[PDB]
């Protein structure tokens, strides 16, 4: 299985799990404050992950820095 | 305080906390206007389980 | 299963999931504003992903930048 | 499963899905305007993809550019 | 306008919009002369489902 | 594309897209399993009105 | 919503949306009370074409 | 499962699918005009692909250009 | 099956296991004090791991340091 | 090669190449499952005419 | 996060979280399968007290 | 434990935790005997909101 | 001409078009002396199918 | 279509496509009314050879 | 599965499919004229491929140039 | 299956096995004195390993040193 | 001495040897306050098996 | 399944398929003349291949040149 | 399945197999004297290996030297 | 090697190596399934002649 | 560690750890399947002696 | 063996291992005849603690 | 000559063509003293099959 | 074919292939009418040896 | 499945197939004369191959030359 | 499966197979004299191999030289 | 499935197959004289191979020469 | 090693190591399935002779 | 001599040839004091098989 | 064969292989008629030791 690393570079970063299946809704949204780190897998229930707010992200494809306004 | 409202809920980015999209109830949050954090469920599930037992 | 990284370089970028199967329509479109990042897998339900608006994209095949306007 | 990346370098690029099976017809044709990007897998239903119009294309075999009519 | 005919249909490259190949009905488009975009199906399927219900 | 199926139909929160409540047809969605969005009616109304006139 | 009914139809200036002129059906709108925008035709034509095929 | 990339360098290039099985006929021929690109997999029905006309081709084995 | 290495660079670091499944709650939080190291796999029950407090972390994707 | 089977035979849209409609033989294709193209008849007629003369 | 389910509920050592002892409901946990921690009661009591007042 | 009852409630200085003033229910605490901290509301409001939804 | 005999058949390299190997019928070509190209089958199969139907 | 009947046959100039000369069958075309092009033979010979083998 | 690339360097190149099984015969022979290219897999029916005439060939083992007299 | 190498750099290092499953408790705690080495796999029963005290550690991810209290 | 108490038991880091967490019995050690080394089990299991047999 | 490339460097090269199984005989021998190339897989029926006459050969193990006369 | 190499650098090195399963005890300890080498796999029965005494050790993760006294 | 089994035996094209035609033994090969080549008889004749003399 | 289970128990060579000989309980080990080592008795004796005194 | 009974117990010098002093039970050893070493307690304490838990 | 004895048989290296190892029949060659080449079997099998048929 | 009967046997010059000399069987060929070449023996010997073993 | 390449550098090279199973005998011995090449797989029937006489040999392990008697 | 190479550098090297299973005993001990080489796999029956005496050893992990006194 | 290459550098080299299973005996010993080469797989019946006499050996682990 | 099982026992060619011929015990090997080599008897005789003397 | 005792047995390193570990029978060698080489079994199995048959 | 009977035994020079001296059993060989070589003992002792264990 495949996972992502997300380090918040500011307070109030959101990691949002989008539901696997026919319908696409947000079943969950974890908050990160500046410096906290979440490591999240894709699952039977999460088939897309949305990040908003400034954060440093590591994926199997390499690093990308989110810039999000909040 | 150790736990804030921001640690329990987060305003739904899609409906900006409204719960409706131009009349019809929002898909993403499912009419709740907020999506709950893991900390939020933790307590809600806990309480809902043991309350009035 | 594969996935893509999409970082919006402007407000109002759309990531549109095209339905797996005989018929091809779009079951969902996620909006991204400047800087938001979506990480989306191909699924039992999404067999194609369309990006419109200025965005930085990472795939298994390497980087590509989608151009808006 | 395999996918391709297609970035249109002009308006009116067509990505055409040719049907898997004994018979070969176009079940679908997605339009891309200048700069839009499509990421399409081969599926139970698409066993060939045709691109027409100027476009930048990424496959597992490397990059190739389609030219405009 | 946000959505054009171009966004719904595309002329079939095989029959050049005709729908017949020297008399016989075209294979690729299946006598339609046009093949539909995802946006096209999205609406057509939506309409066809809910109309007259 | 500018308008998706999500923009037209929303899964009914009561029957979770089923259309029936333990056998009997759902009240909220009216057996449709989906509640139509404003955008949905916009088109459906429009079409139903002008089709075959 | 991206596209509203105002984007598809416009009230006919001649009959002020009525569809009749002192009893007799309106010429300009052709008894429809509303005239269609290019966007309106685009959809209507599209649907009329592909529906039930 | 393998695939080929084919870019036409002239009008009227043909990609011809030869039928999988005991008998070998061509079930289909796609036409490409100068610059069009086809991406075709081998399938339950195509076990060989023939290219005629000037074209640039990419396979798992590397590039080859037809004339 | 994947795992993570977590070394606390301060007292009171928390590694929190988020529950696999439709619902996301935290079943467990391990405390680490300055220098302790935890090595945790993703499991039938943990599908996400949250780290808070200054820590040095090693994943299959490389090093990242939390603050 | 210049002429393919696609150039000779086209699957009948009515019976989806079956040749029967829920048991009874298809009207459109005439139990053939395929409609012959002009190119198809060209050869078939040609051959039928001159063979064993 | 500061408080986890482990902080609220602890599996009952007698029934190994089952809640029954070879059929009959467990004495120690009182059919709960889990023994609530002080933190657990803190909240549960708090809520039970002030909810719907 | 991270959060204790003292973190949520504080004895009402007016009624010394009684809830009544010589018979009649206390004004300041509003018959609760205890006044809520910011942390207290945060939870109570959160729970009250999401419980049984 | 668009299609030549060389586009339909090729002389069998083993029997040099003979069809027999020192008396006995050739294995490779199977007594045909020629092996058919894909273009060859395409037509032969087509004709054999639809002739005298 | 790549190859047409005109590619295979040409009307016999002697009998103007009739096949008979004032009753008696035409010499030049040999009662066929049509004379064959090189392309015509190529196919006919090919087919005649391999059919029913 | 494994395939070969064959580019004819002259007119009348033959790609000959030899039958899979106990018996070895030529079920098929495709003609290539100068410059045409065939891409052919090994199949349930072809377990050997013979090339005759001048042609450029690419296999999983690398390039080899056929020189065949016809 | 995966393992770790643990070399204690002081007396009284603890390698603690945390239980696989819904509940997370310590089923076992091995002591190592200065220089002893433990090689432990993840198992049907151990899904996390905690190290405390100064120790040199080798994983599939590379080396990391635990510091003493 | 070859084997010390340290070689058999280790104090539970969670409950600091107490066996209770603010009243309720500790999860990690399971009310034991200590967790056992391999050497510890080796003897305990050995003894428990053969004692009084 | 494996295969070999054989290019004949003279007329009358033979590629001989030796039968898979308990018994070893040759079910088939293909003739190659100067320059012809055969590409032959190991099969349910061929478990050894013999080359005689001057030929250039490519295998999974690298190139080897068979010498005639 | 994995294995380790252990070369004793002194007399009286112990390689101790810790039991796979819910319970962790040591089913066996092999003695090594200076220079002896043991090559031991992880098994249906050994899920952890403990080394005490001066020894040179090779694992999939690389070399580590256990220190005695 | 100079002579292969292919050089001795050729599969009978009539029975495709079977030796029976829908039950009854094949005429062409004479129940052998294979037709012997000239080389085949050469040896068989030779041997049959001189063996055990 | 200094003492292992191997040091305490040795599998009985007669019953190969079974404890029964084709049904009937083993004589040598006395139904134990294992023979206790001197080290084994050392501890067992020791414990049995001083336990609960 | 690493650990012997001599390592756990030592004969009491006062009663020379007897356990009684001219009839009455020995004070020093407390009727045990043997006094325990630190190693002895270590084990006994350990076992006594964890046995039957 | 095209085929020599060398091309059919090879002396068994184990028994140096003897067929016995100090009295008992050789394992490798199975009392044959020679092992056969592919060319050898090819003929032997061919002959054995068709002789006296 | 690689090997012909001429390669195995040669007509006996003495009896001109007859096998008898004015009634009595020929000495040179030994009633065979044909004498064998080295190639002939090679095969015959080989076969005679290994057949039915 | 694995194969070997054998090129004889003299006349009368023997490639001997040793039988798979409990018993080990030579079911077959192919002769090669100077320059001939054999490509032989290990099979359900051959679990060892013996080469005698001067020959050039290619295996998955690399090249090795057999010397003549 | 995985194997080891053992070359004895003196007379009387022992390669000892330790039994796979719950119990650990030596089912077999092969002797090597100076220069002899044993190539032994791990098996359904051998889950550990002990070498004693001076020997050169090759494993999947690389070379190690045993020094054993006998 | 693995195999070994063994080239004898003297007359009378022995390759000995040790039996797979609970019991270890030698079912077979092949003799090689100077220069002969044997290529032997591990099998359902051989789980160890012993080489005695001067020989050059190639394994998946690299070259080793016996004496 | 200098002597192998192959040196002592050889599989009987008649019964292919079975020891029975379609049920009845094999004649050649005498139900042994294996024929003992001279080396085999050497030892067996030797031992049988001197054992328990 | 070709075969020595060292080629058949090896003294058990664990019990130094004794067969007992401080009284109890040794595990490693299984009371034999020696472990047998492959050469050893080879002969022992051979003999045990064929002796007194 | 590597080892022969001559390698194990040698005829007793005293009794010339008889085993008796004018009736009474031979002293030197001890009634065996044959004396054993070092190699002989090596095997005999080995076997005698391990047989039936
Ligand atoms: N219960 C969620 C937890 C989770 C895993 N990965 C995530 C990514 C984003 C948000 C939540 C998650 C799930 O199993 O899917
Ligand atoms: N429910 C969607 C979520 C999703 C995954 N990838 C996407 C890409 C685009 C839009 C939505 C998605 C699905 O699983 O298919
Ligand atoms: N519904 C289509 C979507 C699709 C996937 N890949 C494509 C390539 C081209 C066009 C459409 C597609 C399918 O599953 O096949
Ligand atoms: N329906 C065809 C489409 C196709 C795949 N590969 C091709 C190559 C050439 C022509 C057509 C095709 C098939 O699936 O097989
Ligand atoms: N019908 C043939 C087509 C083919 C595939 N690969 C080939 C190679 C050579 C000749 C023909 C072919 C087959 O499936 O086998
Ligand atoms: N009918 C043969 C064809 C073949 C494959 N590889 C070969 C090598 C040599 C000779 C023939 C062949 C087979 O499948 O086995
Ligand atoms: N019992 C938990 C232990 C665990 C694994 N990974 C974790 C990460 C964090 C906290 C606990 C864990 C489980 O197996 O899932
Ligand atoms: N009939 C033999 C052919 C063979 C394969 N590999 C070999 C190696 C040596 C000798 C013969 C062979 C088999 O299947 O096994
Ligand atoms: N009996 C334990 C042994 C073990 C394996 N890995 C561990 C890590 C830590 C502590 C103990 C262990 C188990 O199988 O899980
Ligand atoms: N019949 C033996 C042949 C063999 C394989 N590997 C060996 C190694 C040595 C000696 C013989 C062999 C077997 O298959 O097992
Ligand atoms: N009969 C033993 C032979 C063996 C294989 N590998 C070994 C390693 C050491 C000792 C003996 C062996 C077994 O199969 O296990
Ligand atoms: N009987 C033990 C042998 C063993 C393997 N690896 C070990 C490591 C240490 C001690 C013993 C072992 C087992 O298979 O599990
Ligand atoms: Zn919402
Ligand atoms: Zn068309
Ligand atoms: Zn509803
Ligand atoms: Zn009007
Ligand atoms: Zn039809
Ligand atoms: Zn309980
Ligand atoms: Zn009050
Ligand atoms: Zn032919
Ligand atoms: Zn005419
Ligand atoms: Zn505790
Ligand atoms: Zn026939
Ligand atoms: Zn017993
Ligand atoms: Zn006393
Ligand atoms: Zn022999
Ligand atoms: Zn004569
Ligand atoms: Zn027999
Ligand atoms: Zn012992
Ligand atoms: Zn005597």
UniProtKB/Swiss-Prot annotation, chains A, O, Z:
InterPro entries: MtrB (IPR000824), Trp_RNA-bd_attenuator-like_dom (IPR016031), Trp_RNA-bd_attenuator_dom (IPR023558)
Origin superkingdom: Bacteria
Keyword RNA-binding in record: yes
Pfam family, one: TrpBP
A biological-process GO annotation: regulation of DNA-templated transcription
GO molecular function annotation: identical protein binding; RNA binding
Keywords: RNA-binding, Transcription, Transcription regulation
Keyword Lyase tagged: no
Protein family membership: Belongs to the MtrB family.
Entry function: Required for transcription attenuation control in the Trp operon. This trans-acting factor seems to recognize a 10 bases nucleotide sequence in the Trp leader transcript causing transcription termination. Binds the leader RNA only in presence of L-tryptophan.
Protein's recorded name: Transcription attenuation protein MtrB
Lineage: Bacteria, Bacillati, Bacillota, Bacilli, Bacillales
From Swiss-Prot, chains B, E, F, G, J, K, L, M, N, Q, T, U, V, W, X, AB, AC, AD:
Presence of keyword DNA damage: no
Keyword entries, A-Z: Cytoplasm, Repeat, Transcription, Transcription regulation
InterPro entries, alphabetized: Anti-TRAP, HSP_DnaJ_Cys-rich_dom_sf
Pfam families cross-referenced by the UniProt entry: Anti-TRAP (PF15777)
Keyword Transcription appears in the UniProt entry: yes
Gene Ontology molecular functions: identical protein binding
Localization per record: Cytoplasm
Gene3D superfamilies assigned to the protein according to its UniProt record, in alphabetical order: 6.20.20.10
Function: By forming a complex with tryptophan-activated TRAP, and masking its RNA binding site, it inhibits TRAP's RNA binding ability, thereby abolishing TRAP regulation of gene expression, leading to antitermination and increased trp operon expression. AT acts by competing with messenger RNA for the RNA binding domain of TRAP.
Subunit structure: Homopentamer or homohexamer.
Protein name: Tryptophan RNA-binding attenuator protein inhibitory protein
Source organism (scientific name): Bacillus subtilis (strain 168)
Chain's gene name: rtpA
